[PDB]
Design a protein around this nucleic acid. Sequence first.
RNA 1: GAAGACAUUGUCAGGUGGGGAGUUUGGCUGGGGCGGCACAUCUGUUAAACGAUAACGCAGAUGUCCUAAGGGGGGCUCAUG
RNA 2: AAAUAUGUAAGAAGUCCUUGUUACUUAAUUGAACGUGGACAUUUGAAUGAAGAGCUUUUAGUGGGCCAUUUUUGGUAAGC
RNA 3: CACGGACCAAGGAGUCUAACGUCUAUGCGAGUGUUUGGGUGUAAAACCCAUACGCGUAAUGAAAGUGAACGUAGGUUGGGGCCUCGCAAGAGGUGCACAAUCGACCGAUCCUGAUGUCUUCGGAUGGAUUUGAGUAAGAGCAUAGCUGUUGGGACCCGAAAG
RNA 4: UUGACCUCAAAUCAGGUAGGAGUACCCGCUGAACUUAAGCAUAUCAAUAAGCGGAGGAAAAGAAACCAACCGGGAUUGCCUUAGUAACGGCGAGUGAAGCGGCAAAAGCUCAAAUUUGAAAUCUGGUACCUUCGGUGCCCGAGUUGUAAUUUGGAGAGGGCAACUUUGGGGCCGUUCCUUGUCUAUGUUCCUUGGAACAGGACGUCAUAGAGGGUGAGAAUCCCGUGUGGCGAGGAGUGCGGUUCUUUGUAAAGUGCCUUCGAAGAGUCGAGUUGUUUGGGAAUGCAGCUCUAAGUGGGUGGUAAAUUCCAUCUAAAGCUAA
Lengths: 99, 148, 193
Amino acid sequence: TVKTGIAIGLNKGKKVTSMTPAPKISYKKGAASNRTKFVRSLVREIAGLSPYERRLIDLIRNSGEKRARKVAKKRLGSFTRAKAKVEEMNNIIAASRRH
Amino acid sequence: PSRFTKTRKHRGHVSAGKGRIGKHRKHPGGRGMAGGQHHHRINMDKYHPGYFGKVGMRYFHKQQAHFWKPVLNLDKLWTLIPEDKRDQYLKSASKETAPVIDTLAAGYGKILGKGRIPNVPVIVKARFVSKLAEEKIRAAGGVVELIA
Amino acid sequence: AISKNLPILKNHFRKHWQERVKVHFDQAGKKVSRRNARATRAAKIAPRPLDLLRPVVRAPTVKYNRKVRAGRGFTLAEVKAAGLTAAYARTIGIAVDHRRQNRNQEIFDANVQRLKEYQSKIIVFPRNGKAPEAEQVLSAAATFPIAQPATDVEARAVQDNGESAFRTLRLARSEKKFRGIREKRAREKAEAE
RNA sequence: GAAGACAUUGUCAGGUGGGGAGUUUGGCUGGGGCGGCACAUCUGUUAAACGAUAACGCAGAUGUCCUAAGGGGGGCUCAUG
RNA sequence: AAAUAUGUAAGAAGUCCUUGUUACUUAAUUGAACGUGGACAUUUGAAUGAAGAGCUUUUAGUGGGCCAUUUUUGGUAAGC
RNA sequence: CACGGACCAAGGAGUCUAACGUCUAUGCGAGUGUUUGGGUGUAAAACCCAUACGCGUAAUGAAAGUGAACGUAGGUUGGGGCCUCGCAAGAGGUGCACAAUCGACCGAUCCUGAUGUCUUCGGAUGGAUUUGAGUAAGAGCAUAGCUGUUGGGACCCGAAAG
RNA sequence: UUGACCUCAAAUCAGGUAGGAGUACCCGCUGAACUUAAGCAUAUCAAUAAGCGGAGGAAAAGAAACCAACCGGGAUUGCCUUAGUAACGGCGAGUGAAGCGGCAAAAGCUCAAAUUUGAAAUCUGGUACCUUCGGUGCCCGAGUUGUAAUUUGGAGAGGGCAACUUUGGGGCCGUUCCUUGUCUAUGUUCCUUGGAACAGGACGUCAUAGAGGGUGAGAAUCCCGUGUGGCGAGGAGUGCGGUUCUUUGUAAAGUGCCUUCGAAGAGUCGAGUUGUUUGGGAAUGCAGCUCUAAGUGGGUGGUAAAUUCCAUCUAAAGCUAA
């Protein structure tokens, strides 16, 4: 980002000859993969939907993604992991009960 | 060196230094810090006013490293000027021949003031500085260059 | 308790510390074994220095952000900037930072310079039997000292244009402190109907 | 065979609980239990012509009350015979 | 309103003359808080006296008290 | 007529540290601290050096953070020393440290509000009986010891207990 | 019905192992009260006494679901320092650290996740023989529910291109290592008292040998040793110094170029209560009950949560010399 050179402000610190960081395989730990996504899809049709999954899919078709949503924080935890969960759910509604 | 100790100087005088009509009784008023908010509150009021209690907002993960304020001033300042050529930039003080000062690569980020200095044009690469402080630096020839 | 007006001290001595209190009666005793450790090591080690190359690199924090000290390793971008790799660098006697990297060019320079130095200093020999011996130095860090590689030049000219430095960071005070507050008034002035 | 998704069992909350623990369980005080407050206070005195000045000394008050009985001015003079 | 006990007062940080500042204050540079310079040496302002006058530092021990004088509370009275 | 004490000999009672306050002593002296470690050694001594970090010089705020010259570092009185004049006495001037004291300097707070303002930042000046463990041309660092310390068995002995 | 698989097993079964002591010191846990607060329940005591489980010379610790918010630093440890401060507490008594700085000390790495797929290529046990901490002639079983080999976050595989480079290891005796085996200058001349000479006084000598003791009193000089190196012993051992035997070898491996890929650990994570521990305070770790996630996603960012990226490691799998 290169600082402003001065003490504080928008960028606190000296702006010396910066370099572009070499490859850090680390940050891409959560990679899609055609071997993990191919075998992850077979999971949705071999185990299909779970009891609380079926409970929350229709829970949506109930009062909305505010009823099943505030109930997913209790059936899970992190509000961000809670809505990452409601994401793959509307994915099963269209890609299964439609065509 | 029990030699010059007033122990041998009171040995045999019965009481041995703490009396006999009251004496020293292990922990008379208490042990450690005797009843501050109790009977020893007369020792804190007048001698230690303000110990008990809380003050302002609390700070968490407050390292004195992120709160580093190495302040300096005008009365001296020439202290960071190397002796060898310090005399050269004092009397024969001129412009273009200005003294380069890296106060952070020295350990004095903040530069403030006190008792003036001789009218000399010098570059001072600092971090932070006071308002009335930089005021006097300019009227003599001194300048400021902010680095980190 | 208390006896008249005395200094208030919070002394830590109400435990079994009188079981776990070690007065160093082996102070300089270990100092001696420290030399014999390096000395015994070199007795079988024949001509090796007993210490590899420690990089150079400025310290973090608002306090140590002005003193470049000795680092750990030399990354794959500098073992490659060395002419081989990190597996060849350590089997010779050069550090390698598997977790750390190259962030500022200024340091990459003073280091790759110091890289060819020890690289022309490593008197390496073959593995058959001939292997010619040639003296040995019992150092490496104190051998190529880091006396703050590049800080500035003593002489320069006065550059007066009009910044004050005080009012520059007084408004840079407002710049850093009124970033998101004047950015909330930027989205407010981004949707007028 | 009986009992059967209620008990059993794992876990919380709820209730009971001197059966069990731990601890205090004011002090002053003509010894002290008791009464009293001579406890933070304060009316005049005790106090011996400054002040300071004991006691479970003495004849007592204190925990509230008042948007006016207060503020300020104006007019007026009260008890009483 | 006695006696007996009590606080203050007896000078160079003072008094006599001049009159400079103030956003003070005065009808008012008027007055006052305050200075400049001018006159007076220890009869410089009653007695008498000082291991020196003054002053900060610093810590122990005592924080159960008891007799005598006159004044005096209680109390029969008390070596209470 | 309170108490221990038959009688004699030797053990036996304000000790040390960890960090400090007092008084003073000494090195250096706005520096200091070599001794954590590294070089050397007749060898645990002594000797040497470093980068450190500490403390101090810088404080005032609850914190953001801000952060000590009207003035010869100053107005007024008393002052040691020096000085000059003087037979002495003193007249008089220059009056460290220090004691009393008026303004002032900086922070925080209470105020006012010139400047320009990515239009709420920014905040000189004139201010307030406000204000603080400061400035008013550094005195600390480092050590030994003396009285006191408080954490410890803590002046020596002992409780019922737990 | 015959050879069987799948499961429980099974006898003084082959060849082997696991149980106590010890608790100066490590890791767990457990679990105090006195005292302190002038009493005392808070807390302190103390995340300590006793109790209990399993090792070593060191041990745990250690390669990042780190630290920071810097030009960022770069395994943790120990130490001065941080700082008796931030922080906790009738915010009463008290309790109380960590990054980095200085430093000593220094080390790296390896398993699942892949098609060996032109051939289980990997090994136990046991047996004639042999040049043995073992092996070859030979055979079963282990074993295809995954062994070899393969690669692993720092990366790396398949296809090809067109080149270069690194040696593998025993005998022989020394050095390096532990204990070491042993020789090792100097005198016993005299006087004075003495039981006795190590003594008062001398007189010589050694002094890389005045440590110290002993010997019939103060012994440098009589005995051993000491100081000083030498000549041998028992073994350790290819670190080093190399020589002889083995070219073992159409043996494997590291580095450079484009493309495609790039699998990366779950009743765990976190969340919600109890309470324990606490610097860690609207969760610091931890155990339990319950819940129960993902893949440019996730743990952290020390005032809770909502919200866009940023920074920042890749957990949940493993050993590792100071």
